[PDB]
Amino acid sequence: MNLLIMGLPGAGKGTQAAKIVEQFHVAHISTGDMFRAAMANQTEMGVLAKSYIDKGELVPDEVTNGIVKERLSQDDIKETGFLLDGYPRTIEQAHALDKTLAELGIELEGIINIEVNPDSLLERLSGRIIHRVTGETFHKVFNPPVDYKEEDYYQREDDKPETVKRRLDVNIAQGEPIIAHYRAKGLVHDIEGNQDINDVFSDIEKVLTNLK
Template identity: 40%
Template sequence: MNLLIMGAPGSGKGTFSSRLKDNYSLAHISTGDIFRKNISENTALGQEAKSYMDKGLLVPDDLVNRLVLDTLENLPEGVNGYLLDGYPRTLEQAKAFDEATKGTANEVDQILFMDVPHDVLKKRILGRRTCPKCGEIYNIYFKPTAVENVCDNCGSALSARADDNEESLKTRLGEYTRMTQPVIDYYGEQDKVAAINADNDFETIWAQITEALGK
C-alpha cells in the first residue's frame, strides 16, 4: 500500500503518519529526511542538493523527484509500502512522479487529505505552547494548563515557537493553498483522494482513515 498524506500546517499529518507507519508497516518518508540522509552519507544526489541549499536556493523539482525515486527503490526490508509526507509539493512534481511510477510497484494507491478549516488551523498553531523542560505540548484553546502559561507537569514557564505567529501563519497557509491545492485536485481527478475531516478527536479521525484505506 503506497500512500501520500497531505494537509496544511497544523492538520495533524505528523501525528497520524506515525500511527499509519506502525499499524500498516509502511516506510514513512519525508523530503527533509531524504535530504538529510543523502547529505550525511555524501551521496552524489546529496552533494547536488547541498550545492543549492548552501546558496539558500530551493532544490529544483527534477532533483527532488530523483531523490524521492531513489529512496523508493531502496526501501528497507519488511515494509508493506510507503507513506510519503511533504511530497509532491507542486503539480509539476506530482505529474513527474506519476510518469515515473505508473504501472510499477511504486505507483501511489491513495492520497489522504487532512482537511481542516483555516480558522481551526489558526487556533491550533497560534495557541500552541510547549514546555522547554519536559516537552509537554499544550494549546490555550484546546488543551489549556491549570495555571496560565505554566506547565501542569513540572511547573516551568511555557513558550511558543518563533514562527507560530499571525504573519508567518498567513504566509505558510497562503503558500500551501497556492502550491498544494492543485496537487490535491490533480489526484482527485484520478479518484485517489480520501478527504479526512481532521477537525475531530483523534479516534474519530483514525476511524475515518482506516475506513478509507479499507475501501
C-alpha cells in the same frame, strides 16, 4: 499500501502519519522531516533547504524530487509500501512522482486528504511544541503533554506567526490542483479533519483497512 497523505500546513498530517505508521509499518516519507534532519546535521542540501524553509517558501522542485526519488528507489518500498507526507507539493512534483512510481511499479493506491477549516491553522501551528527525540508534536491547548519539562521540547523555527502566514498562502495556492489531479484518478479519500485527533485517526484507519 502505497499512500499519500495531504493537507494544508497544520492540518494534522504528521500527527496522523505517526498513528498510521504505528499500525501499518508503511515507510513514512516526509519531505519536511527529511529537510529538517539535513538542516540539523548541516549537510549541503540542509543548508540550501533552510534558505527556503525559514521564509516559509517551497524548496525548489529539482532537489525535492531528487531526495524523494532516492528514498522510493530503495529495496524495502515495493514490499512494505509507503506513506508520502508533504509531497507532492506542486503539480510539477505530482507529474514527476507519477512517472517514477509507474517505473518502480509502486503506483498510488490511495490519497488521504485531511480537510481542515483554514481558519483553524494559524492557532494549530502557533501552539505547536515538539518533543526532541521523537519529533512527536503536541499543542499547548488542544493536545498538551502530561508533565512538561522544557529540556524535552522545542518550537519549529518556521512556526513563527509571520512564517506560518506565508506558508499558508503558498500552500493554499498550490494545493487545489494537486487534489484535483488525484481525485480525477479515483484515488482520493476526503477526511473530516475538524475533529479530535483520535476521531480523525479512526476515520483514517477505516479507510486504510478497507483498501485492497
